[PDB]
Design a binder for this molecule. Structure first.
Ligand SMILES: Nc1ccn([C@@H]2O[C@H](COP(=O)(O)OP(=O)(O)OP(=O)(O)O)[C@@H](O)[C@H]2O)c(=O)n1
Ligand SMILES: Nc1ccn([C@@H]2O[C@H](COP(=O)(O)OP(=O)(O)OP(=O)(O)O)[C@@H](O)[C@H]2O)c(=O)n1
Ligand SMILES: [Zn+2]
Ligand SMILES: [Zn+2]
Lengths: 146, 310, 310, 310, 310, 146
């Protein structure tokens, strides 16, 4: 497994294969700062989990929440002097920016200098995502078919 | 500042009941009391990247009736922008460097809402963005229902024709759903039925609706009959002609209608309303087109004027 | 003289179970033992008033693979002098004085049938008449179903995509509903379902059919998976692109597919079958195009030759 | 009479240093002090026979800000004139029988200078004649350099991009060459280098220039960086993408620039200036577009007004 | 089986000095002793997705002069159904199930190479793939050089015109740089010079080449004068029409040309070779077109026939 | 360093910010075996570097060489039972499949279901990468652009 850190965030309990989505999408590797990444770690407790440890970096508030659509069980932990100071769970945000794509080929978001913005509506058997632009509502299943 | 002063009018959903009664109260007052030098020395861009002549001529006659100057274009028949990497963003960042308001019709949904990011402080009024919104057509309809029915509350409103694709009927159902006790009848061929998310919001608000198969069923209780164009091309030719007979209105059909019943249509009207309804007192679609002028002036007066005493 | 000799092939519906079979037997013979100079000295007209290159190159290669000369045109626009007032009747009335057979594709339904009336006794062959028939397509689909499966009776055929407007899926259902024991699984969007009359014919004969929401619901039962191309332009962009997790085929969905299952598709293909499906054994749509030559060769050999010795 | 009163503005070379400081002093004064009824009752023809939307909308917003009326057209998408033997001469002899000024964009070089022979006493302002001149774009650039650098003399000016074909950069080099001690850096792929006759005149005047290979070389000493569009089509695709890396500006490149450094671009800007420079204080190309209004008003005020007290 | 049997002809660069020679020997044989029924019973596809009539009529006449059937299309626009989403891969995947060889010209480079990957084992022949290769052109140029000169080694070849973008001049240099003792004189505008990499390959092999300003500088030394067509649209109108006294050929300039010198040109010709050059003995470009048939016949005979007896 | 693996490959002394690129580009991350990663370390002289430890997977001669355009100093340690039974260095291959995008906008490679492939030549100074399809040649600088 990978060893403990002094200060930073350890994003524990990422299900398998999502840990790489999280690095790409939230661009966490773009810091010349110590990151330890363990992928397909066992932990009998989930069969397989992934775990990113970014040292001396504090993912705050919204950042935690954006992970809610990808690895909603990730325990986000602060460590700011040798041990776990806070422990956090991803909460669904009211809006998700940048990372999604609009499924509507005729939405203007597709050619233009524009960050996707979607409004989150949790409709019982799923979450609906409504684009800022074309205003169409989509099952997150369709926005993540991608 | 009046509450719409300097606002971008991009969607009906962005506007409150009060913003809707504000635009409609002004339109009434400008119909009664014309204000021909109010926007003098203002220049308005009329950017129709998708050519729609009626919306354009209505919008630019409005701008002229408050003395604004108009500059602009209709692409579809092409100009120069749109192609050669000219991103819409970049186009808007150049245009709002010399106009005071931008009226635009665009083929891609979301385009007016993107203009808004780059115009800074010039207002963007949506003359139609793809299959999304068209706020200014809903404001002239609501103005025509108000003008004729005297109210916007407690109506019996039948939406007839292509309900699935009709942009116009989706916005009106959302706009009237903000007023109370409206009752809707939807008459549509099943291939063209009113899509679930509109019906869904009506439920959530406890607003009554039903679906009827022929206009005959509901004529008696209806105040406003909104006809939409069944795009012939939306069906195959033999599907189109062969409904049971059809969903076209003829004057005979109107003989049970209430005196206050009005037939409304966004136009073009090809064959869904026969020629002989025109002669009826109930035919209101050309008068409806003419209130596009008043509702369209309201907007330009309110967005561009800090205070209005009319 | 054989059953189909000098007979007009215009609709699947007009050919009997025995004619279908005779076409498929001939075709399997010509395939094995090519007769390259059978139609030697015939001139055939390839009149595409609507253009399709695949069909036109399947058909002209069929004519040439049997040693016939071709004269013709393709179009979807102004042909040549054939445009000004020259009625199709008159066009046929003149061309049936030159050729030995007329293969024609045309944009309006019953064009090959009106043609039959002016051919004299020159046989016309329908390469597509609008959204009505395309019998040559269906013969090659049946030959390929038959050649991968050993039979045309007691098959569990799944049909996917635009079952409402797909010309090929309605001809193929009719055709396989002339054989015994077939079970059809129809998988399509609500907006693009199997027309009631296909279904009603299917019931008059006692044929078992069922509507399913997606392909992985029938995956294991299906002998033939006939995909059709879902057309973007007949649907709103947001509508088309939605449908939850779609009706496109991918290689992993083929893991619980029977050994003998083949995925057929009339082509073009773009969205609905992904490239990884190509290297799977169940990929049969390019060989399906190849079998067009033998189906088309057979049909020209029988219609144009008295007693066919093969 | 002011000295440009009733003059035809066809080329930069026709204008003296003093005429250039006159147009630029007026533009300053009209930006500070707007004169909205100055050209009232004047009608200006806007004849864009080659459609260029940005130059057109800028020119006609200018005309509207001094209260002139505009009549005109954009051909490219065609009208009626130009074809059926209608010589340009004859067209101008008819148009100047009812307008007061003619603003024209034409595809053939020399066209504005021929209009001049037939308009008699109506002024002809050149909005672009082929690959020859465009005086009004050089006046808004010089206005933008003056406005930002405070001077037009003693500058360090880098011309980057397609220097051989860029009409815009040839006129600016000729116009600034009339002021003293300007120093030019030309950065261009060798296929697109600044043509000898410009370099030749610079020598004759003892005006310093050099050619540099990358923008990095000269960033530190430069006051005005004028980017031109490398028409992708001017090279083959593999020549275009494969310069050493490229001659595109990104904000990082600007980190050694002087506080007073401005990036200028005639627009369209496709990819030569990355999106992230926009956010820099140095990005000045949209502000540059907006001074097209002021420089364009100057002209119409001076040509049409005998005396100006502003 | 011969070297080239069932082999894909895609680039001059991929064929060896011995393959070139084998092509030229075959060609000279078929020319003398025509074998008109060699490809009897093959069907060849002539797929011009970009149209060229000369190349298409050289190639289809080659197929017919060897008794093969042809099926195909030409385009530069919408083909037929081949346009909507049908990827070139899929098009080839279907057509290689019908024909025996695919001759294709296409607008984007490597199209015939991507095609090779979907042909199965049906050989594809490159009639032009964008600005990359046109090997069939070069074989007929080499056959004509060889047939007027007796050899392909130790020739002084002058190449004129657009040496930068002329597809034919870069293939022909490569090809003649596989033979011994050749000297090239390159005569072109600075703007349209021989690309550095041709020159650098030429140096790695020790091949003597030189840049010259005009044709009358090499007139007396040159065995072959390969003219190419200077394209007006790639140059400013004043630029093109300038170049001092031009690089066009006229009959009087041929007075000090060697007896054995021939002026070759791939064609169209318009400006660069004047009509009086036609009646001179040194005129060889129409006979050069004629030799396309033998070069193309040879190439189809070898690729499609095992052991070629001639 | 992190610590030690039983069986597998340790690619060490990948520059810094090239480490993620290698994980994504060459798909190292789609295994079920435990991959642990260190981004911006020291423990291989220079200062900072990246390290990818993939266990129970070892890289072929050519897979090692694929890394040479990105990582060329990187050492590819073949590890069996806690000791380095082998050490390879990326060297230039003559062909680079799938990973580059032909600069030529009119090359057919773009529109189509084909993997890119380039012919590599020269060494150290300029690496010239030639397209399989359009046969146009580019400096590796220009290819490694967008
Ligand atoms: N300085 C530190 C402290 C703890 N850890 C790590 O962070 C987790 C410890 O936080 P904590 O929530 O107490 O541990 P668990 O109980 O393992 O968390 P959970 O059960 O939610 O997975 C561990 O995964 C261990 O790898 C670390 O990396 N660096
Ligand atoms: N079971 C092991 C053994 C070594 N390593 C790693 O293998 C590399 C060390 O290779 P090795 O040849 O043992 O060490 P050196 O190359 O001698 O170390 P250096 O050059 O830094 O001195 C390092 O990436 C270290 O993380 C590993 O991951 N697992
Ligand atoms: Zn959207
Ligand atoms: Zn390429």
């Amino acid at each position: 497994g990978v060893e403990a850190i002094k200060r930073g965030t350890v994003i524990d309990h990422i299900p398998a294969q999502i840990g790489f989505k999280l690095l790409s999408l939230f661009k966490l590797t773009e810091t010349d700062q110590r990151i330890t990444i363990g992928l397909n770690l066992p932990s009998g407790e989930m069969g397989r989990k992934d775990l990113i440890k970014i040292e001396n970096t504090f993912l705050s508030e919204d950042q935690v929440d954006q992970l809610a659509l990808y690895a909603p069980q990730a325990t986000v932990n602060r460590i700011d002097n040798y041990e776990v100071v806070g422990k956090s769970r991803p909460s669904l945000p009211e809006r998700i920016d940048n990372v999604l794509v609009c499924p509507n080929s005729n939405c203007i978001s597709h050619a233009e200098p524009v960050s996707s913005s979607f409004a989150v509506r949790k409709r019982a058997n799923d979450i609906a995502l409504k684009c800022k632009y074309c205003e169409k509502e989509f099952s997150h299943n369709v926005v993540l078919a991608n | 500042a009046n509450p719409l002063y300097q606002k971008h009018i991009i969607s009906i959903n962005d506007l409150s009941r009060d913003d809707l009664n504000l635009v409609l109260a002004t339109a009434a007052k400008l119909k009664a009391n014309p204000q021909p030098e109010l926007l003098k020395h203002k220049v308005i861009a009329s950017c129709f990247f998708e050519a729609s002549t009626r919306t354009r001529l209505s919008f630019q006659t409005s701008m002229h009736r408050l003395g604004a100057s108009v500059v602009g274009f209709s692409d579809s028949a092409n100009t120069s922008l749109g192609k050669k990497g000219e991103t819409l963003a970049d186009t808007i960042s150049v245009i709002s460097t010399y106009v005071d308001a931008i009226v635009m019709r665009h083929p891609q949904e979301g385009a007016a809402r993107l203009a808004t990011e780059f115009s800074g402080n010039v207002p963007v009024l949506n003359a139609g963005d793809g299959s999304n919104q068209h706020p200014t057509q809903t404001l002239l309809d609501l103005f025509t229902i108000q003008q004729t029915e005297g109210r916007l509350d407690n109506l019996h409103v039948a939406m007839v024709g292509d309900l699935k694709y009709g942009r116009t009927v989706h916005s009106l159902t959302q706009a009237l759903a903000k007023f109370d006790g409206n009752r809707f009848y939807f008459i549509a061929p099943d291939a063209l039925a009113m899509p679930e998310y509109i019906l869904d919001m009506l439920d959530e608000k406890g607003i009554a609706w039903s679906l009827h198969s022929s206009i005959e069923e509901v004529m008696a209780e209806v105040d406003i009959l909104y006809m939409t164009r069944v795009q012939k091309e939306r069906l195959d030719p033999s599907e189109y002609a062969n409904v049971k007979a059809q969903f076209v209105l003829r004057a005979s059909d109107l003989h049970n209608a209430k005196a206050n019943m009005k037939v409304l249509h966004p136009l073009p009207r090809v064959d869904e309303i026969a020629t002989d309804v025109d002669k009826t007192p109930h035919a209101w679609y050309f008068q409806q087109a003419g209130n596009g002028i008043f509702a369209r002036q309201a907007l330009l007066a309110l967005v561009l004027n800090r205070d209005l005493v009319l």
